Amino acid sequence: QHILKNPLIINSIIDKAALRPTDVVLEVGPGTGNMTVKLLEKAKKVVACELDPRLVAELHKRVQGTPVASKLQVLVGDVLKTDLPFFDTCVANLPYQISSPFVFKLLLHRPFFRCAILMFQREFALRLVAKPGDKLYCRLSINTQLLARVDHLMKVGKNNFRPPPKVESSVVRIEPKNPPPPINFQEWDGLVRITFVRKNKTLSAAFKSSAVQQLLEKNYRIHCSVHNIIIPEDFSIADKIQQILTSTGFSDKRARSMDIDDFIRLLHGFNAEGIHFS
Incomplete structure (x- = not known):
């Protein structure tokens, strides 16, 4: 699991999420909470999804005694199989292994969310926005583009995480078409x-x-x-x-x-x- 550590990138992701003080934010892969504690200051509620319970205990301790501690709700479970609640916006640090299942879960999620700002591996992001005729154009390109507007937002070098992954990363915006x-x-x-x-x-x-x-x-x-x-x-x-x-x-x-x-x-x-x- 790769912890995002650069504050400029975190701040950039939160900005593109276009948070509103009334928003429920779904944060997937909270890690140690570096983005979580910034989300709690700008959102009505943060639902963080974490599979590891020892990371849950530490994320909870890090906000304990804070005025925003009661806005944190931690969904403990595997995100692909869980029944996601309502949220307005999603920010997520996503492992490659689960990147495709998780996109289609979001696209078919009801009720609709406004915006998801997702961290992916570079190649996965490139397949999301590939155009017809491109070498990376695939099922994933056309299914995502049918159901959502998707934009490649920024490249993220591997030395912004700890430990550094061995592929580069990309930030992507996904807005579901509503109605589809x-x-x-x-x-x-x-x-x-x-x-x-x-x-x-x-x-x-x-x-x-x-x-x-x-x-x-x-x-x-x-x-x-x-x-x-x-x-x-x-x-x-x-x-x-x-x-x-x-x-x-x-x-x-x-x-x-x-x-x-x-x-x-x-x-x-x-x-x-x-x-x-x-």
């Missing part, structure tokens, strides 16, 4: 996953997987049973997928160069024929 776009994110993610298995290969190739065929055949059976369609004896899911990809012009395209509108068009093409990624 009228896209079934469950189906979206099923489709985006399939196409990014091999993002430099075509979509035609991406759907020839037998795992893909199996999943779409299951869903198609549900569709046909629900609407009393009789599947002809010679029906072929592979042919039908290929027809749709061809009719909508996506057959030869690659996921690495597809933007959000391209995928909305792709998903529309499939759903129109009763093919769901559920």
